[PDB]
Amino acid sequence: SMTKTSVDCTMYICGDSTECSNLLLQYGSFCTQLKRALTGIAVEQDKNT
Amino acid sequence: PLSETKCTLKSFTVEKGIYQTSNFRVQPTTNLCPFDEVF
């Protein structure tokens, strides 16, 4: 198994800036699918073990 | 918290589980200058 990892879009891309966070919504469903992929990877690691 | 999940999954019924709804950020809460020589 690997190390289960999780990524926060707002903290990574925009940090603590509010304006960047507001502008981030315009790009759509990127973060949803990124988090879905990472969650699937983590559940897969647990299933492997 | 039930609805913040219902709203995220775009569904009105949820099945037993752990789902990541969002994130919890704690939001934000002597050499004196010689004026005495002039004034």
Side-chain angles (χ1 to χ4, degrees), chain A residues 1-10 12-49, chain B residues 1-9 11-26 28 30-39:
Chain A
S1 57
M2 296 189 292
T3 287
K4 301 161 65 182
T5 190
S6 67
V7 176
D8 182 0
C9 292
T10 63
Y12 178 82
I13 297 161
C14 296
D16 47 359
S17 171
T18 304
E19 304 86 3
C20 181
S21 179
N22 301 324
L23 289 196
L24 187 54
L25 282 72
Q26 301 181 5
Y27 286 66
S29 60
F30 272 119
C31 282
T32 291
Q33 65 182 357
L34 275 295
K35 190 182 55 173
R36 284 209 308 270
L38 285 178
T39 304
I41 292 171
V43 182
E44 180 194 295
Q45 302 328 303
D46 289 280
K47 181 266 290 180
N48 292 327
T49 311
Chain B
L2 184 49
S3 305
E4 198 163 324
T5 288
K6 287 179 172 186
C7 167
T8 56
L9 322 173
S11 166
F12 272 61
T13 59
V14 175
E15 293 177 350
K16 213 151 51 75
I18 169 167
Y19 303 98
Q20 172 157 350
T21 189
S22 202
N23 64 34
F24 170 53
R25 292 173 296 180
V26 153
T30 41
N31 171 17
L32 282 166
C33 286
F35 284 162
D36 174 0
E37 288 153 24
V38 177
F39 285 77

